[PDB]
Amino acid sequence: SPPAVPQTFQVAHLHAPTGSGKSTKVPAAYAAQGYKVLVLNPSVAATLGFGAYMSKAHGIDPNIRTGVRTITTGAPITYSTYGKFLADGGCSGGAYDIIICDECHSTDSTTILGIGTVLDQAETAGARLVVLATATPPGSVTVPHPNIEEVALSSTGEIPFYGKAIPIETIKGGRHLIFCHSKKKCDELAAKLSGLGLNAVAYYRGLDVSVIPTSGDVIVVATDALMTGFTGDFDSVIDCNTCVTQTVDFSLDPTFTIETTTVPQDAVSRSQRRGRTGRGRMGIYRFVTPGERPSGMFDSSVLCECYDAGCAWYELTPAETSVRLRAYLNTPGLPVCQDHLEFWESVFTGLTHIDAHFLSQTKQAGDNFPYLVAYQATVCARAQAPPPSWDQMWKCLIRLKPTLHGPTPLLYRLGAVQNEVTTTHPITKYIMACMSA
DNA sequence: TTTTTT
Ligand SMILES: Nc1ncnc2c1ncn2[C@@H]1O[C@H](COP(=O)(O)OP(=O)(O)O)[C@@H](O)[C@H]1O
Ligand code: ALF
Ligand SMILES: [Mg+2]
């Protein structure tokens, strides 16, 4: 039996290995007790996947809510992504008795902001139980899984893979999942395997979950868009053991810089990726490297991304997002980070009167910090000055050069700077004061 | 050079 439901609001932690049944069995047990359950996951493929399965294996077609697709059935169970949950208004888009926060170990801004939202509104919203579920709580390390056998890759094999090689034999038939660190890498591999006579398909953000055949032989080459909560019935998993990290650097040149670099995977990633196999049956995990870095903490850039997301996506004021983030930090058992809430709130509080047209173009482009990018562009346009550079990031200005001249009013560094720079603009000064003190 | 939101 799952974490019992208390009379009044309470927060509980649920730790169980990957494939245990936290996302299906648990909520199914709550529903059977007559409770309305809301399950939040960071992944789109995962959210969508629960639908067909819960129906066939637990006799209940649940509601599915994702940015791209939604399925309303009126059932007592609802599965949604943190993103769609926020976009729907948080704890105001429905009244549930139980809210399960899956993959609560995640350190992506969307999940952070999501969980912070529920921990701040759940009680008042009438929720009596909030469950923080995960197979890899902060501080934990990868341990042996009862359904998974691990076999290291070697220099033997006809398919080059991050230094090592992949024997065709291990993937000739059956169903297998290969994790790559980049999107182009997936397309490269998928193509190569297809040219070898194998049925391979690439998968990542944006692609339809249907590209993954529900049955039959197949080799899915994907990114971390298929790292958690997903069950593709894979006979094995091949891990490149490489991740893409993003950190903020207070370089005072003139302000801060957000750099995205490829680094070796941590413990969270290793267990979750490995966990995509051996789900309800035996499985095999092949890797390139045995080591794994620690987990349980996240960079300050993530906080920055939350405020940016709150402004550009969720119509949240910097102060409002601070109320939600505070709730997250005040909750034990969750990933920790430097308490810079006030610093970031003050920075975004100063970025006023952004150009709507520019924002709607940065969001469409799917940038990491749409708001910051759009604001930098707003300051340039309103200064008759050119952007930091001319790469895709600043395409919203490309059709304006005839009027853009002089130095760029650099507010911060989102990418490479190739034009002349000025650090005397009021906004730049403002941000500097938020840093120095 | 990853994912999630109109
Ligand atoms: N979409 C699915 N298709 C087939 N089997 C599934 C599916 N989803 C879940 N299962 C089965 O139920 C088990 C529990 O899945 P799940 O609740 O998602 O695990 P957890 O949340 O603990 O990672 C899995 O081991 C798997 O065998
Ligand atoms: F939630 Al899991 F494997 F732990 F999908
Ligand atoms: Mg799960």
DSSP letters, A158-224, are SEEETTEEE-GGGTSSSEEEEE-SSHHHHHHHHHHHHTTT--EEEE-TTS-GGGS-SSSSEEEEE-G
- Return the ligand number nearest the Cα of A232: 1
Cα A404 to chain centroid, rounded? 36
Q: What are the pocket residues of ligand 2 if the criterion is a CB atom closer than 6 Å to any ligand atom?
A: A 18-19, 22-23, 102, 135, 228-229, 275
3-state secondary structure of A145: coil
State yes or no: cis peptide before A335, omega within 30 of 0: no
A90 strand B contact, CB < 7 Å:
no
CA closest to C1' of B4 belongs to A83
Q: Are A13 and A333 in contact (CB under 8 A)?
A: yes
Q: What is the CA angle A364-A370-A372, rounded to 5?
A: 155
Kindly write down the DSSP assignment for every residue of A242-265, as one continuous string.
EEEEEEEE---SSS-EEEEEEEE-
Q: Which of A385, A391, A425, A392 minimizes the C-alpha distance to A407? A: A385
Kindly write down the DSSP assignment for every residue of A379-420, as one continuous string.
HHHTTT---S--SGGGHHHHTTGGG--S-EE---BSS---S-
Distance CA A134, CA A112 (A): 14
Distance CA A63, CA A74 (A): 7
Backbone φ, ψ for residue A333 (5° rounding): 85, 0
Rg of the Cα atoms in chain A: 23
Q: Is A47 in the pocket of ligand 1 (CB under 6 A)?
A: no
> How far, CA to CA in Å, does A48 sit from each of A7, A42, A135, A210, A333?
32, 11, 20, 10, 28
Indicate the helix (H) or strand (E) that contains A101.
Answer: strand A98-101
> How far, CA to CA in Å, does A309 sit from each of A113, A169, A396?
9, 45, 19
Residue A195 in tokens: 């040219």
| Residue A23 C-beta-side C-alpha neighbours within 13 Å | 30
* Amino acid residing at A46: A
Indicate the helix (H) or strand (E) that contains A151.
Answer: strand A148-152
| Residue A152 C-beta-side C-alpha neighbours within 13 Å | 7
- The angle, 0 to 180 degrees and rounded to 10, between the axes of the packed helices A341-350 and A426-436 is 170
Q: Resolution of this PDB entry, in A?
A: 2.5
The preferred substitution site among A24, A50, A102 for testing ligand 2, maximizing ligand atoms within 8 Å of CB, is A102
Q: Is A49 in the pocket of ligand 1 (CB under 6 A)?
A: yes
Longest dimension (CA), chain A: 68
Distance CA A12, CA A24 (A): 17
CA of A136 to the centre of ligand 2 (A): 9
Residue A433 in tokens: 């004061």
What Å value separates CA A9 and C1' B3? 31
**List of domains in chain A:** 1-138 (3.40.50.300), 139-242+264-295 (3.40.50.300), 243-263+296-437 (1.10.820.10)
Distance CA A283, CA A235 (A): 5
Kindly write down the DSSP assignment for every residue of A4-24, as one continuous string.
PPPSS--EEEEE--TTSSTTT
Q: Are A165 and A134 in contact (CB under 8 A)?
A: no
Scanning every strand, the nucleotide with its C1' closest to A110's CA turns out to be B4
**From its phi and psi, is residue A304 left (phi > 0), alpha (psi between -120 and 50) or beta?**
alpha
Backbone φ, ψ for residue A426 (5° rounding): -50, -45
CA of A22 to the centre of ligand 3 (A): 5
